[PDB]
């Protein structure tokens, strides 16, 4: 490994994603294959490319060293194996969705999805999301309200 001069970058970089981010998910990759990463990188791909991460770090000692910053709801995620996912642009989006759909294709556990932060809380798969731009679901709420 590297000394501190390197354990600091994995911090100053990874914590300015939290400081400058959008949504957060969860997942434990016990059996995390590489067809695994391959896929989810195309997903990050659709979800821009390299706007996304997953930098395995669940050393509390790392991606909690980014938490007493923001998201101190994660002192509780960080135990055991974890795969932290941050969003920069994009809706508070679909990121959420396929992690459940992925891991529900066996694709290993999902930490039961211990969940995360947009609010400041816990678990439950939501597509309360990428409807986003479904302001059309407030366009159809126009003419249909005007007519009916």
């Amino acid at each position: 490994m590297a000394l501190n001069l390197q354990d600091k970058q994995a911090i100053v970089a990874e914590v300015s994603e939290v400081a400058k981010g959008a949504l957060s998910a969860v997942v434990a990759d016990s059996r995390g294959v590489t067809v695994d990463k391959m896929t989810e990188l195309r997903k990050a791909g659709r979800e821009a490319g390299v706007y996304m991460r997953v930098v395995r770090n669940t050393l509390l000692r790392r991606a909690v060293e980014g938490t007493p910053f923001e998201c101190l709801k994660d002192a509780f995620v960080g135990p055991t194996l974890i795969a932290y996912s941050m969003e920069h642009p994009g809706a508070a989006a679909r990121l959420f969705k396929e992690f459940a759909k992925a891991n529900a294709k066996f694709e290993v556990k999902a930490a039961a999805f211990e969940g995360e932060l947009i609010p400041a809380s816990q678990i439950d798969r939501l597509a309360t999301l990428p409807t986003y731009e479904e302001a059309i679901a407030r366009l159809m709420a126009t003419m249909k309200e005007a007519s009916a």
Binding site: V35, M38, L41, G45, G49, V50, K105
Partner: protein, 141 residues
């Protein structure tokens, strides 16, 4: 495909799917049907092009028949009909012999867009650097 089971790739040919000395039998003999790669392959052959290198995987269990898959061409080979020289040395690579087309390497690599990890299609180029410094043949960039 979320589960591999059987795959042997021995670059075939399009214009007539009916070999015998190169592959022929050895392409289908363990629950595989020699009768159906001339019924099925050529059904996915003429839409594109014919004659040149075709690696391939098939869907044979022990289920009599099957369904054929397609693939992609080798990448250092697109430096033959897609560059110049067709060997790679002549003076063993104690001598840096080859010679490149910088324009090519991107769009000629890009032709292999469906089988690479780089998000940045420029990245997919940077891979072809070493794939094309495979001898020490410098590119006139």
């Amino acid at each position: 495909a979320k589960k591999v089971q059987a795959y042997v790739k021995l670059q075939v040919a399009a214009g007539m799917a009916n070999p015998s000395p190169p592959v022929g039998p050895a392409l289908g003999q363990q629950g595989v049907n020699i009768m159906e790669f001339c019924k099925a392959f050529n059904a996915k052959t003429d839409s594109i092009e014919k004659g040149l290198p075709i690696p391939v995987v098939i869907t044979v269990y022990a289920d009599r028949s099957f369904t054929f898959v397609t693939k992609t061409p080798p990448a250092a080979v697109l430096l033959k009909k897609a560059a110049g020289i067709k060997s790679g040395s002549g003076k063993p690579n104690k001598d840096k012999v080859g010679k490149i087309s910088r324009a090519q390497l991107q769009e000629i690599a890009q032709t292999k867009a469906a089988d690479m990890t780089g998000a940045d299609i420029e990245a997919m180029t940077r891979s072809i650097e070493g794939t094309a410094r495979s001898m020490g043949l410098v590119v006139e960039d």
